[PDB]
Amino acid sequence: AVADKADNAFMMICTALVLFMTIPGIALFYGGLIRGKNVLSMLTQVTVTFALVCILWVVYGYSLAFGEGNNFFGNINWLMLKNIELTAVMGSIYQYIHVAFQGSAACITVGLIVGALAERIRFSAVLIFVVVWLTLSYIPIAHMVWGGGLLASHGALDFAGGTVVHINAAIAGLVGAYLPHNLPMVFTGTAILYIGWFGFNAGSAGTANEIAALAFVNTVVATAAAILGWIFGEWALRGKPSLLGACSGAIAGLVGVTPACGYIGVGGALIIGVVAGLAGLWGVTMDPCDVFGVHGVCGIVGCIMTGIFAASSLGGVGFAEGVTMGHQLLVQLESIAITIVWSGVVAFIGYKLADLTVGLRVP
Amino acid sequence: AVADKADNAFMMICTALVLFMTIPGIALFYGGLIRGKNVLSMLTQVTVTFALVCILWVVYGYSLAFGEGNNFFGNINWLMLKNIELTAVMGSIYQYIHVAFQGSAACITVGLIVGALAERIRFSAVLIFVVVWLTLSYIPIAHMVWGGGLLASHGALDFAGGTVVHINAAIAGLVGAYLPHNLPMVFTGTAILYIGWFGFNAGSAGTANEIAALAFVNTVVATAAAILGWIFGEWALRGKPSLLGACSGAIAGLVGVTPACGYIGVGGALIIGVVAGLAGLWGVTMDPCDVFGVHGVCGIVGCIMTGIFAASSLGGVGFAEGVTMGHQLLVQLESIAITIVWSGVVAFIGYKLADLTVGLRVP
Amino acid sequence: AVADKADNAFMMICTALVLFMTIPGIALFYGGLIRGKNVLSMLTQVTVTFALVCILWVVYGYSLAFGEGNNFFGNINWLMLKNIELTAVMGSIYQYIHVAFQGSAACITVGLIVGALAERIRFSAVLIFVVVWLTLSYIPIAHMVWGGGLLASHGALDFAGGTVVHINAAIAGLVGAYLPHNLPMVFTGTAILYIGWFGFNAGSAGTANEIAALAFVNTVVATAAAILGWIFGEWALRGKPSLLGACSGAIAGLVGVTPACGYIGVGGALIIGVVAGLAGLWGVTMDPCDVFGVHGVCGIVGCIMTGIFAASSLGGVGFAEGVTMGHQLLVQLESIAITIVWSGVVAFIGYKLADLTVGLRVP
Ligand SMILES: CCCCCCCCCCCC[N+](C)(C)[O-]
Ligand SMILES: CCCCCCCCCCCC[N+](C)(C)[O-]
Ligand SMILES: CCCCCCCCCCCC[N+](C)(C)[O-]
């Protein structure tokens, strides 16, 4: 295996773009939504926990997520990236770039939860939770889906983190919840997330090829379909579009297309944006800062609709051989369930530990 | 034709950077200029119409702009990108990346007009206009200049959208006009536009080659020459530089260099920044948020000065064989006129239709 | 020598990212720190002096920095980049891209000083200073370190500007000093600097290779180690972390890792973030907007700790042959001293000239 420099370049810029989604994307997104008295604190918890996620990733996270192991977790053979030679290639890029790319995804996922709960959760409790849930939920699920684990070895399609990122975080966010002051800033964070999101979606191809290209366009497309789906729905229900309505729409589409971008046709992308846009709207019409209402609802949707629109018939890249659409759909449904239930338990364990240790508070 | 992954990578990042110019670049630029009571609305119209432009592009825009057709428009053979195979190569990159790159340019152009008129134009009227003018002005002109059409087939030089983007939008903006509350935010939008602008200028080479490199440097250069041209002029006239004066200067240079970046020497870039900077200043001294004063004036200027500084004599890449500077200059002048008059008629038709349909308003 | 397009692409995006650090990164960073009545002015001086640095670079800066010359400065043979053929290759990329990359570094360095002193220094005095100090300090030191000069030809390790950028600017900032209103904005500027910083650190490899990959990861790593080092230290001393404490932490790590990113192991990166984080904290506990407290202190630290962690023993890329760690450490110490004293004299000459010309003021 030899590293292609074009792929190195692409994937290093993609990692930067995903890094950009957390710092400052998600921070500015929540920063404009939450009460003003809470913004600095929230900004601090996103920053400190990003730092944290970065460190646990390098120390053992990556090895556990992407080390060869069982169906559920990797190994502790790549502790602080050792026995990864500098010139070790994975795919068509240096493994170090995989390490950095994959860590940036862990980061935005944690950032999605931490920003939602920075208000109500006590700092030390968030840190405890983050450590628990990254280790026992993000990493194992990462392994199961992208790391050769249970779900991958069963044929699950999730190009860019419909389960790993979105459903996973949405359920974490809900268990927590269970247990807008600056719209310009909200828009900026949305804009930065959207731009950074191409690093995540396109870079999930691991190379600058026809598939990254496909992921890219499907992302422009489904983000736009969703925006208009939301906006029209909002104009139907509420009489007029709103800025927050437009930004939520975009996220609904970005979320919905996340599992699907690498597998579907643009026709399929557009239909996905549309449906995710409206389901997002319906979702928030029926949970901290609507974490689930958009990420949970839309993630489930994207994941299901991937096992439809991958069909070569519907302009998709085609299912694996011997895989009927019906089998793929069951496998999607299974992946979703396994993610919902797994992130749930772990979330509950995280929040409970934090609570029995420092208390969820705040004081 | 085989896709070069380095070019795929480059052009996918360039598209992201051009996407960044609209979301949130232009939005934040106007967001700080216009009255506060109008910002959210403007932010919403830029977002919703971006979504729209994205969708019309995928549906028929691209096929009409870059399909093989006549002198003026392409075909409806690539409706929803069909009969474009995934691995179809155009230039040295996948065609899908051309689709995404070219759509991001349509987006920033519409964003330039929509932001300027979000205040005074009624939403549904903007949408109607956008549809009319994208279809009948942006697309045909795109085709004429970059799509094998009338102006290209006559030797016009316009590397990165002096006519297609700037003059085109400036005239749209003027017909409309005919028919600063947050300078920090203005600066941020300027900064984001400038950074994103390298995707547009350098990526217009279609490859990561000596010409992209040339476009890049000419962009650093002419943006700086212009800033100082404006600033000094402002210090001469007004007694001191201003932040808005500095940001306008930058845009004057970015606009002025847009047609020229791929064809000229750095000596030529600097002279272009200087002249565009002062003409921009003179321009706004003598029209919504000075859309024309800078884009129209400076676009015309860049376009004219391209047919001078392309000269191999003046450090440029040289004119095509058999093309004297005098012939190039006439061809520039013709391209400008054709753009001014074409965008005018279409603009007028767009605004008139909107007016007879929903009314330009606002209520 | 033949240009690799993957490297062209990578380095053109890296330059964009470094450009992003100044416009708007550093501007927004200082913009939120300094008094509100001073923000627009500061924003204007960063913009105008960036423009300036861009122009002097193209005119003679690059030729003086990277032209073949003596130990201390290059030549005036590349005035306005002439006798640099368009297709001239340097390393594995077009020379034009080196020109643009290296100029973007000059820009962020000047931006670091100008933002710090925009308040207290008179405009014309800043301009005079900038011209003096860029020409006589930034350029010669650039030449000495990255341009084949005294320090390089003695084996100094400074991957990405520990002396050239950080110590150099910190001493300029101190001589000047000798002679927070918006924390959300501070965070945004920090975020943008951090993201842009990967262009500087990774792009300093000149290619998208295992070393750029190494630089990248070491950057994620040391920024995170530092954030937590600062944060814990701040929690130890002040009872709780703060947003500004978190952002300063990040910068401490980014600065500290700057010389080292291309030479060390991730184990070494983490230790560097930790130590730089605390030394930054200790630094500001014991100078405009703590320019030295973080850049001077942390730069010195990174530079020293590079001559330790480069050791192949400590997971580093190894010292040059015949170079013991002890010899490298002396060479680091010498590089630092030469930089501290050189930037000092020149700074003093710059400020003194400005003072005798227009007066440091402000009026
Ligand atoms: C592959 C993409 C991974 C990105 C993770 C999430 C980023 C978008 C977050 C937007 C938050 C919107 N909201 C309020 C519905 O949660
Ligand atoms: C190839 C570049 C295409 C970019 C289109 C326009 C972006 C810059 C817009 C700045 C608006 C400045 N103003 C007020 C003079 O219109
Ligand atoms: C290789 C990196 C070159 C970047 C130059 C400096 C950028 C960071 C500036 C942050 C300023 C922080 N502060 C207040 C301590 O000066």
Question: Is B200 near chain A, with CB under 8 Å?
Answer: no
CB pairs under 8 A between A and B: 144
Question: Is B6 near chain C, with CB under 8 Å?
Answer: yes
Q: What's the token pair of residue A322?
A: 């011997």
Question: Of all helices (H) and strands (E), which one includes residue A94?
Answer: strand A93-94
Please, what's the b/e burial string for B304-317 (b: 16 or more CB within 10 A of its CB; e: otherwise)? bbbbbbbbeeebbb
How far is the C-alpha of C138 from the C-alpha of C61, rounded, in Å? 9
Longest CA–CA span in chain A (Å) reads 60
Answer for the pair C230, C277: CB distance below 8 angstroms, yes or no. Answer: yes
Please, what's the b/e burial string for A168-206 (b: 16 or more CB within 10 A of its CB; e: otherwise)? bbbbbbbbbeebeebbbbbbbbbbbbbbbbbbbbbbbbb
Question: Is C216 near chain B, with CB under 8 Å?
Answer: no
Region for B149 from its dihedrals, namely left if φ exceeds 0, alpha if ψ lies in -120 to 50, beta otherwise: beta
Answer for the pair B119, B35: CB distance below 8 angstroms, yes or no. Answer: yes
How far is the C-alpha of C298 from the C-alpha of B277, rounded, in Å? 40
The structure tokens 């927070």 sit at C180
Q: What's the token pair of residue B181?
A: 């509350």
Beta bridge partners of B93: B90
CA B358, chain centre distance (Å) = 28
Q: What's the token pair of residue A67?
A: 């080390």
Q: What's the token pair of residue C348?
A: 């003093």
The amino acid at B291: V
Angle at B17 between CA B12 and CA B18, to 5 degrees: 95
Angle at B158 between CA B152 and CA B159, to 5 degrees: 110
- The DSSP code sequence of A243-285 is HHHHHHHHHHHHHHHTTTTTTS-HHHHHHHHHHHHHHHHHHHH
How far is the C-alpha of B231 from the C-alpha of B238, rounded, in Å? 10
Answer for the pair B39, A188: CB distance below 8 angstroms, yes or no. Answer: no
Nearest to B227 among C27, C47, C94 (CB): C47
Residue in B185, B171, B181 with CA at minimum distance from that of residue B27 = B185
- Coil vs helix vs strand at B310: coil
Q: What's the token pair of residue B307?
A: 């047919």
The residues near C46 (Cβ < 8 Å, ≥ 6 apart) are C22, C26, C27, C30, C111, C114, C115, C118
CA A177, chain centre distance (Å) = 19
How far is the C-alpha of B264 from the C-alpha of B273, rounded, in Å? 12
- The DSSP code sequence of C246-268 is HHHHHHHHHHHHTTTTTTS-HHH
Rg (CA), chain A: 19
Residue C349 C-alpha to ligand 3 middle, in angstroms? Answer: 23
The residues near A353 (Cβ < 8 Å, ≥ 6 apart) are A128, A129, A132
The amino acid at C305: M
Q: How many CB atoms lie within 10 A of CB B52?
A: 22
Q: Where are the alpha helices (DSSP H) in A286-324?
A: 291, 297-309
Integer angstrom CA distances of residue B37 from B43, B119, C240? 11, 9, 39
Q: Which residues line ligand 2 (CB under 6 A)?
A: B 21, 26, 29, 108, 112, 160-161, 165, 193, 197, 200, 251, 258, 289-291, 294-295
Q: What's the token pair of residue A333?
A: 């449904």
- The DSSP code sequence of B51-92 is HHHHHHIIIIIHHHHHSS-SSS---SSSGGGTT--TT-EETT
The nearest CA of chain B is from the CA of C162 a distance in Å of 25
Give the torsion through C-alpha atoms of A170, A172, A173, A175, to 10 deg: 120
How far is the C-alpha of C331 from the C-alpha of C309, rounded, in Å? 14
Q: What's the token pair of residue C116?
A: 């710090």
How far is the C-alpha of B157 from the C-alpha of B162, rounded, in Å? 9
Percent helix, strand and coil across chain B, each to the nearest 5 = 75, 0, 25
How far is the C-alpha of A93 from the C-alpha of A88, rounded, in Å? 9
Beta bridge partners of B94: B89
Answer for the pair C81, C58: CB distance below 8 angstroms, yes or no. Answer: yes
**DSSP-assigned letter for residue A319:** P
Q: How many CB atoms lie within 10 A of CB A36?
A: 11
Answer for the pair B191, C50: CB distance below 8 angstroms, yes or no. Answer: no
User: Is omega for the bond preceding B220 within 30 degrees of 0, making it cis?
Assistant: no
Question: Of all helices (H) and strands (E), which one includes residue C90?
Answer: strand C89-90
The residues near C182 (Cβ < 8 Å, ≥ 6 apart) are C31, C32, C36
- Coil vs helix vs strand at C93: strand
Answer for the pair C92, C132: CB distance below 8 angstroms, yes or no. Answer: no
Rg (CA), chain B: 19
Query: Is A100 in Cβ contact with C216 (below 8 Å)?
Result: yes
Q: What residue owns the CA closest to ligand 1's atom 6? A: A112
Longest CA–CA span in chain C (Å) reads 60
How far is the C-alpha of A142 from the C-alpha of A63, rounded, in Å? 11
The amino acid at C57: W
Answer for the pair C186, C243: CB distance below 8 angstroms, yes or no. Answer: yes
Region for A157 from its dihedrals, namely left if φ exceeds 0, alpha if ψ lies in -120 to 50, beta otherwise: beta
How far is the C-alpha of C130 from the C-alpha of C168, rounded, in Å? 13
The amino acid at B169: A
Count how many Cα atoms sit within 13 Å of the Cα of residue B17 in the half-sphere of its side chain: 28
Query: Is B15 in Cβ contact with A10 (below 8 Å)?
Result: no
Ligand 3 atom with the shortest distance to the CA of C293: 15
Residue in C195, C263, C277 with CA at minimum distance from that of residue C228 = C277
How far is the C-alpha of B135 from the C-alpha of B60, rounded, in Å? 9
How far is the C-alpha of C126 from the C-alpha of C327, rounded, in Å? 39
Ligand 1 atom with the shortest distance to the CA of A293: 15
What burial class does residue A341 get, using C-beta atoms within 10 Å of its C-beta: 0-12 exposed, 13-18 middle, 19+ buried? Answer: exposed
* Strand pairing category for B93-94 and B89-90: antiparallel
| φ, ψ dihedrals at B61, nearest 5° | -60, -55
Query: Is A58 in Cβ contact with C223 (below 8 Å)?
Result: no
How far is the C-alpha of B19 from the C-alpha of A1, rounded, in Å? 34
| φ, ψ dihedrals at A94, nearest 5° | -55, 135
* C104 is an annotated ligand-binding site residue: no
The amino acid at A62: Y
Residue A254 C-alpha to ligand 1 middle, in angstroms? Answer: 8
Q: What's the token pair of residue B308?
A: 């001078």
How far is the C-alpha of B324 from the C-alpha of B280, rounded, in Å? 28
- The DSSP code sequence of C296-343 is IHHHHHHHHHHHHHT-GGGTSS-PPTT--HHHHHHHHHHHHHHHHHHH
User: Is omega for the bond preceding C362 within 30 degrees of 0, making it cis?
Assistant: yes
Q: Report chain B residues whose CB lies below 8 A from the CB of C196.
A: none
How far is the C-alpha of A243 from the C-alpha of A222, rounded, in Å? 18
Q: How many CB atoms lie within 10 A of CB B197?
A: 28
Q: Where are the alpha helices (DSSP H) in chain C?
A: 5-20, 27-33, 39-56, 62-66, 95-117, 123-133, 139-146, 168-178, 183-203, 210-238, 243-257, 266-285, 291, 297-309, 325-357
Answer for the pair B28, B192: CB distance below 8 angstroms, yes or no. Answer: yes
The residues near A173 (Cβ < 8 Å, ≥ 6 apart) are A112, A113, A116, A117, A287, A288, A291, A292, A295, A296
Residue B112 C-alpha to ligand 2 middle, in angstroms? Answer: 6
Integer angstrom CA distances of residue A85 from A81, A88, C317? 8, 5, 11
Residue B234 C-alpha to ligand 3 middle, in angstroms? Answer: 30
Integer angstrom CA distances of residue A57 from A63, B185, C113? 8, 36, 35
The residues near B106 (Cβ < 8 Å, ≥ 6 apart) are B53, B57, B61, B65, B134, B138, B139, B142
Q: What crossing angle do the helices spanning B39-56 and A243-257 adopt, rounded to 10°?
A: 40
Residue in B301, B299, B98, B300 with CA at minimum distance from that of residue B205 = B98
Integer angstrom CA distances of residue C103 from A27, B274, C19, C260, C262? 31, 19, 9, 21, 20
Count how many Cα atoms sit within 13 Å of the Cα of residue C229 in the half-sphere of its side chain: 29
Rg (CA), chain C: 19
* Strand pairing category for C93-94 and C89-90: antiparallel
Q: How many CB atoms lie within 10 A of CB A97?
A: 30
Technique behind the model: X-ray
The amino acid at A334: E
Longest CA–CA span in chain B (Å) reads 60
Ligand 1 atom with the shortest distance to the CA of A109: 5
User: Is omega for the bond preceding B288 within 30 degrees of 0, making it cis?
Assistant: no
Query: Is C242 in Cβ contact with A47 (below 8 Å)?
Result: no
Query: Is B220 in Cβ contact with C104 (below 8 Å)?
Result: yes
Q: What's the token pair of residue A119?
A: 């208000």
**DSSP-assigned letter for residue B319:** P
Beta bridge partners of A93: A90
Probe ligand 1: pick from A18, A42, A102, A112, max atoms within 8 Å of CB? A112
Enumerate helices (H) and strands (E) in chain A, giving the number of each.
15, 2
Residue in A207, A28, A172, A5 with CA at minimum distance from that of residue A101 = A207
Beta bridge partners of C90: C93
Question: What subunits make at least 3 CB pairs under 8 angstroms with A?
Answer: B, C
The amino acid at C13: I
| φ, ψ dihedrals at C85, nearest 5° | -60, 150
Q: What crossing angle do the helices spanning A325-357 and A123-133 adopt, rounded to 10°?
A: 140
How far is the C-alpha of B304 from the C-alpha of B163, rounded, in Å? 11
The structure tokens 């501007």 sit at C27
Give the torsion through C-alpha atoms of C106, C108, C113, C119, to 10 deg: 130
Residue in B4, C27, C335, B80 with CA at minimum distance from that of residue A264 = B80
The structure tokens 């129209």 sit at B296
Residue B307 C-alpha to ligand 2 middle, in angstroms? Answer: 22
Integer angstrom CA distances of residue B24 from A168, B64, C52, C161? 28, 27, 27, 31
Answer for the pair A300, A336: CB distance below 8 angstroms, yes or no. Answer: yes
Resolution in Å, one decimal place:
2.2
Beta bridge partners of C94: C89
How far is the C-alpha of B47 from the C-alpha of B59, rounded, in Å? 19
The structure tokens 């860019």 sit at A160
Question: Of all helices (H) and strands (E), which one includes residue B15?
Answer: helix B5-20
The amino acid at A148: G
Probe ligand 1: pick from A19, A187, A294, A301, max atoms within 8 Å of CB? A294
Please, what's the b/e burial string for B323-343 (b: 16 or more CB within 10 A of its CB; e: otherwise)? eebeebbebbeebbebbbebb
- Coil vs helix vs strand at C34: coil
How far is the C-alpha of C86 from the C-alpha of B134, rounded, in Å? 37
Residue in A75, A79, A98 with CA at minimum distance from that of residue A7 = A98
How far is the C-alpha of B35 from the C-alpha of C4, rounded, in Å? 49
Sketch out chain A's domains with CATH numbers: 1-363 (1.10.3430.10)
- Coil vs helix vs strand at B94: strand
User: Is omega for the bond preceding B362 within 30 degrees of 0, making it cis?
Assistant: yes
Answer for the pair B185, B196: CB distance below 8 angstroms, yes or no. Answer: no
CA B312, chain centre distance (Å) = 26
- Coil vs helix vs strand at C72: coil
Nearest to C212 among A12, A52, A87 (CB): A12
How far is the C-alpha of B307 from the C-alpha of B302, rounded, in Å? 9
How far is the C-alpha of C125 from the C-alpha of C133, rounded, in Å? 12
The residues near B337 (Cβ < 8 Å, ≥ 6 apart) are none
Answer for the pair C245, C234: CB distance below 8 angstroms, yes or no. Answer: yes
How far is the C-alpha of C160 from the C-alpha of C173, rounded, in Å? 20
Residue in C338, C335, C340 with CA at minimum distance from that of residue C156 = C335
Q: What's the token pair of residue B110?
A: 């519409």
| φ, ψ dihedrals at A138, nearest 5° | -60, -50
How far is the C-alpha of A101 from the C-alpha of A217, rounded, in Å? 21
Q: What crossing angle do the helices spanning C5-20 and B210-238 adopt, rounded to 10°?
A: 20
How far is the C-alpha of B297 from the C-alpha of B310, rounded, in Å? 20
Ligand 3 atom with the shortest distance to the CA of C173: 16
How far is the C-alpha of C146 from the C-alpha of C336, rounded, in Å? 15
How far is the C-alpha of A343 from the C-alpha of A110, rounded, in Å? 12
Please, what's the b/e burial string for C54-85 (b: 16 or more CB within 10 A of its CB; e: otherwise)? bbbbbbbbbbbbbbebeeebbeeebebbeebe
Q: How many CB atoms lie within 10 A of CB C353?
A: 16
- Which chain C residue has the Cα nearest residue A81? C266
Beta bridge partners of B89: B94
Answer for the pair C252, C298: CB distance below 8 angstroms, yes or no. Answer: yes
Ligand nearest to the CA of A34: 1
